[PDB]
Amino acid sequence: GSGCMKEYCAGQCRGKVSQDYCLKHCKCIPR
Numbered sequence: 001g002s003g004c005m006k007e008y009c010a011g012q013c014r015g016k017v018s019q020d021y022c023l024k025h026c027k028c029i030p031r
Contacts, residue, residue, distance in 0.1 A: 001008070002023075009022035013029065021029035 004026035013022045018029040
């Protein structure tokens with residue numbers, strides 16, 4: 001995919017940096 005996919009990352013995780021973490025790591029950002 002594009003990292004992971006930009007579609008998938010907005011369908012699972014929210015906000016620019018959280019979605020950017022999914023673009024790097026195929027998961028949502030930790031707290």
